Ligand binder design. Structure first.
Ligand code: HEM
Ligand SMILES: CC(=O)[C@H]1CC[C@H]2[C@@H]3CCC4=CC(=O)CC[C@]4(C)[C@H]3CC[C@]12C
Ligand SMILES: [K+]
Ligand SMILES: [Mg+2]
Length: 407
């Protein structure tokens, strides 16, 4: 690996540990290459926090010099991560709060109390599936049987996605996220997803129900109402995020606890909270690797560095979770007892901070203890260190997770 001043992010995710350490070492601001496209990566905790609140960094792709010049187009395999419709995800400034408010109100801890029974029912159902799958000592994929379906069920219940449509959504997302999907097919899948959620919003407009989509469509009376584009945009964002991140969180938490059985014991015996184990998982091995992307509306002076107007800026959240300045020398270790376990920014910071953090945390806090209580001798049927990532550049997406129920 001969010295380079640009760090190429390997889209096959062949050396995530090496790559994450190289980003930390090269940071807190360093040049990266995303499939032939240059950007800056923010890899330090403090600098990330400053920049995530800097109003000169915007989501709007039309602020991107390479987009303005036509240098980057829809042929770029990562383009679907940023060139999306109007929503809380793409907006900044005073307009942004309007696009967030119904969702944040709906996803408060207290409002989520009402969704808890549903989450509990789905966890119980999928554990029944695990039991069936793992009978007579057979090897089971913890991902396909338990972790992969659960968050789709949950976010679907919340948004009003029919039971019978969820399999198709998962199929689309898998194609959408895989770097291997041919770009023409990925763009088709993106159109097909948009068509689906467009019709879903038309369905809920004609016949509203007790779900968040209906609430985005029909606001309290006072308004002003969200456009069709905004409702669909929020909808797609909530489902995509709600599913994809949460799967990873469940799987990494299990892998972390199973490879650190002494720390699994701490949570089982009630000496450390499950919630604390989940925070350290978010810090150490969290759902987001990189977040695309922000752009400078003008020059941003950082004292001994300048991010030029038009430049693309990525938040390298995995690298950021391994910040030694913040977490100490053992940042690269999983340690649910560390003082800084909950001091991560793995859900972001500033205006665009994750609105679903309480739901993510709640799903994990129900699912994890339920899994280990039900199957106390759960163990890997494959060395945990041999579980590969899927080729998904921006997301910490585990391929499969072979276990035995034990015993
Ligand atoms: C489970 C683990 C999760 C992690 C690690 C996570 C992480 C994040 C991060 C880091 C951002 C902001 C990126 C940035 O602006 O720099 C974010 C934004 C967002 N997340 Fe979460 N998230 C999680 C679960 C969820 C869930 C359950 C939902 C929905 C129910 C969700 C919906 C969103 C939406 C809609 C945005 C965009 C908000 C905005 O830009 O204003 N994510 N997520
Ligand atoms: C940080 C993270 O993993 C989540 C939070 C917001 C999510 C994005 C929300 C908007 C969105 C809509 C889509 O239709 C494609 C997926 C994307 C582009 C999502 C990709 C994963 C993101 C980036
Ligand atoms: K578009
Ligand atoms: Mg050099």
């Amino acid at each position: 690996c001969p010295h380079s001043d640009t760090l190429t992010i390997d889209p096959m995710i062949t050396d995530l540990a090496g790559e994450t350490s190289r980003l930390r070492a090269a940071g807190p601001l360093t040049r990266i290459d995303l499939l032939g496209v240059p950007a800056l990566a923010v890899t330090g905790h403090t600098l990330a926090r400053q920049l995530l609140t800097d109003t000169r960094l915007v989501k709007d792709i039309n602020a991107w010099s390479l987009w303005q010049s036509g240098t980057v187009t829809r042929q770029w395999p990562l383009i679907g991560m940023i060139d999306v419709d109007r929503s809380m995800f793409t907006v900044d400034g005073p307009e942004h709060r309007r696009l967030r408010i119904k969702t944040t109100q709906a996803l408060t801890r207290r409002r989520l109390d009402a969704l808890k029974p549903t989450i509990e029912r789905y966890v119980a159902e999928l554990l029944d599936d695990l039991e069936r799958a793992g009978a007579d000592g057979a090897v089971v994929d913890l991902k396909s049987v338990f972790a992969y379906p659960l968050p789709m069920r949950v976010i679907s219940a919340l948004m009003g996605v029919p039971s019978e449509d969820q399999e198709q959504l998962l199929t689309w997302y898998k194609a959408f996220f895989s770097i291997l999907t041919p770009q023409d097919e990925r763009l088709r899948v993106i159109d097909e997803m948009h068509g689906y959620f467009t019709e879903m919003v038309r369905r809920k407009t004609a016949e509203p129900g007790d779900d968040l989509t209906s609430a985005l469509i029909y606001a309290t009376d006072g308004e002003t109402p969200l456009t069709e584009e905004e409702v669909i945009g929020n909808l797609q964002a909530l489902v995509a995020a709600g599913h994809e991140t949460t799967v990873s969180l469940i799987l990494t938490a299990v892998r972390a606890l199973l490879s650190h059985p002494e720390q699994l014991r701490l949570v089982r015996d009630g000496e450390i909270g499950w919630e604390t184990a989940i925070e350290e998982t978010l810090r150490w091995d969290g759902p987001v690797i990189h977040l695309l992307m922000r752009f400078a509306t003008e020059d941003i002076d950082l004292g001994d560095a300048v991010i030029p107007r038009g430049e693309g800026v990525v938040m390298s959240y995995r690298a950021i979770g391994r910040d030694i300045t913040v977490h100490g020398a053992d940042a690269d270790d999983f340690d649910i007892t560390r003082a800084t376990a909950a001091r991560h920014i793995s859900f972001g910071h500033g205006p665009h901070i994750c609105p679903g953090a309480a739901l993510a945390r709640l799903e994990a806090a129900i699912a994890l203890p339920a899994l280990f209580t039900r199957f106390p001798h759960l163990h890997p049927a494959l060395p945990l260190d041999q579980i590969p990532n899927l080729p998904v550049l921006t997301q910490n997406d585990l391929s499969h997770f072979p276990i035995h129920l034990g015993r």
